[PDB]
């Protein structure tokens, strides 16, 4: 959940700097003397068990992909029954076999995962 900042003048990357005196987070540039205050205090995250990428591929034309299986599940939003579906597109040994469905009318994505902790995808 990092977002990444660049110098307004150089477009080089910004690095963190503590404002020792007032106890605040700055990003500075190493190439200009530009600086700006930080948006959050999170500067680094490492997900060991990640979901980024389960849904990669979902694209306006997903339903013209003849190779994808189809089902008659209904979706939560449109109550339509035109889906395509696939497994997780992370390419792990340690993935579930859960399915991801894509509603072909309203483009809503949903899962067959009955322990869904996911909001987003």
């Amino acid at each position: 959940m990092t977002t990444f900042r660049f110098c307004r003048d150089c477009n080089n990357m910004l690095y963190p700097r503590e404002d020792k005196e007032n106890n605040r987070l700055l990003f500075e540039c190493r190439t200009c003397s530009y600086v700006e205050e930080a948006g959050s205090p999170l500067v680094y995250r490492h997900e060991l068990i990640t979901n980024i990428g389960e849904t990669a591929g979902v694209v306006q034309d997903i339903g013209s992909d003849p190779t994808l299986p189809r089902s008659d599940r209904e979706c939560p939003k449109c109550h339509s029954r035109e889906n395509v579906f696939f497994q997780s597109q992370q390419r792990r040994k340690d993935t579930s076999m859960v399915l991801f469905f894509v509603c072909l009318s309203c483009s809503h994505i949903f899962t067959s995962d009955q322990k869904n902790k996911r909001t987003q995808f």
């Binding site: 190779t67 994808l68 299986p69 579906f85 696939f86 497994q87 040994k93 340690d94 993935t95 579930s96 076999m97 859960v98 399915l99 067959s112 995962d113 009955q114 322990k115």
Partner: protein
């Protein structure tokens, strides 16, 4: 026998339904692995046990039904040539093919052949040959059985070469 065939075909139908539930089950995330064994490895282990245990029952079925004058059976009973697996594959069902200890893998993307749709883990899709040799194989099964076969012919040359050097 006609009746034996129908039993064999039901024996097989029931294993494919076992498979379909263990499928639906992993698909809803309700299956558990147990202990260092991944989900997908647990899935596979189970589907292969089902599919083997089907082969075998279907083969026991055929063996039983053959009479004492059945000349295949006479050879087997004498000990002079052939065994159960041969009855079985000839008359009841040839069974799961495998390459490196696993079901036929997805060598196109997410599929074993272009005649299947993606993410298909079913028996057909990964190498179960439901037919016996008498009945004949379909084209897909034919190609997966040749995959398998091929692995024995290579394994066999490597064994022969490996063994010969050890022996010396």
């Amino acid at each position: 026998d006609g009746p034996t065939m129908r039993e064999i075909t039901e024996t097989i139908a029931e294993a494919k339904k076992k498979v379909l539930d263990v499928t639906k089950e992993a698909q809803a995330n309700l299956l558990t692995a147990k202990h260092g064994m991944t989900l997908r490895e647990s899935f596979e282990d189970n589907v292969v046990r089902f599919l083997n245990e089907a082969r075998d029952k279907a083969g026991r079925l055929a063996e039983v039904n053959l009479k004492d004058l059945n000349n295949v059976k006479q050879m087997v009973m004498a000990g002079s040539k052939g065994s159960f697996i041969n009855i079985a594959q000839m008359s009841a069902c040839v069974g799961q093919q495998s390459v490196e200890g696993k079901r036929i893998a997805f060598g196109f993307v997410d599929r074993t052949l272009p005649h299947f749709s993606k993410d298909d883990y079913s028996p057909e899709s990964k190498g179960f040959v439901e037919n016996s040799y008498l009945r004949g194989l379909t084209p897909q099964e034919f190609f997966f059985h040749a995959m398998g076969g091929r692995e024995g012919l290579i394994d066999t040359a490597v064994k022969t070469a490996e063994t010969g050097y050890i022996q010396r």
